[PDB]
């Protein structure tokens, strides 16, 4: 443990977080990776089990694993369960790549409780108009909604974010994001 250090999984929250998640995996494929989630949906014939998803045969068993606290974030969509498991985050991180995560803010303590202490970054907009600045592809109704949801997220989870990132542009946001990971890399 003194010589080799596991790569800390990464949870970026807030406006443009998916654009940051896309960009980081693109810019450094050997440093950042994605983890395979489980679903109870049946696979299409071009989806590859164990690589695109882990396809769960017994849907009854997935909720047994969910109640055994085997997932950090679970969910349903179109009648099918979805979820990132703890073992799927450990597999990326043990390759020493930072695992890029689409989890809610609630998954931070469960990763911590599982000792996979993530870098939790909150992108914080400074106004409605500021959301319009760092995301020039949303309508005001989407911006106002983006701004309120951000406000509630900081109120409830401000204490679990390793860094809060601000800027007048995604370029500025994305720079500071990359540097937080540098200063918390290890």
């Amino acid at each position: 443990s003194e010589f080799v250090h596991y790569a800390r999984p990464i949870i970026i929250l807030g406006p443009t977080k998916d654009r940051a998640n896309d960009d980081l995996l693109s810019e450094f494929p050997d440093k950042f990776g994605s983890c395979v989630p489980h679903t109870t949906r049946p696979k299409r014939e071009y989806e590859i089990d164990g690589r695109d998803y882990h396809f769960v045969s017994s849907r009854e068993k997935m909720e047994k694993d969910i109640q055994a606290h085997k997932f950090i974030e679970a969910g349903q969509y179109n009648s099918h369960l979805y979820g990132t498991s703890v073992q799927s985050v450990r597999e990326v991180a043990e390759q020493g790549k930072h695992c890029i995560l689409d989890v809610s803010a609630n998954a931070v303590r469960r990763l911590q409780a599982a000792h996979l202490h993530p870098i939790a970054i909150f992108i914080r907009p400074r106004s409605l108009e500021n959301v319009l600045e760092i995301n020039k592809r949303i309508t005001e109704e989407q911006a106002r909604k983006a701004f309120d949801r951000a406000t509630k997220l900081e109120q409830e989870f401000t204490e679990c974010f390793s860094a809060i990132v601000e800027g007048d542009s995604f370029e500025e946001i994305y720079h500071k994001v990359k540097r937080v990971i540098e200063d918390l890399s290890g």
């Binding site: 896309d22 994605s34 679903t39 695109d52 969910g75 349903q76 990132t84």
Partner: peptide, 12 residues
């Protein structure tokens, strides 16, 4: 991530 929009969609 782009092959798992249904997952991403489920989490919200």
């Amino acid at each position: 991530r782009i092959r798992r929009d249904e997952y991403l969609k489920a989490i919200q």
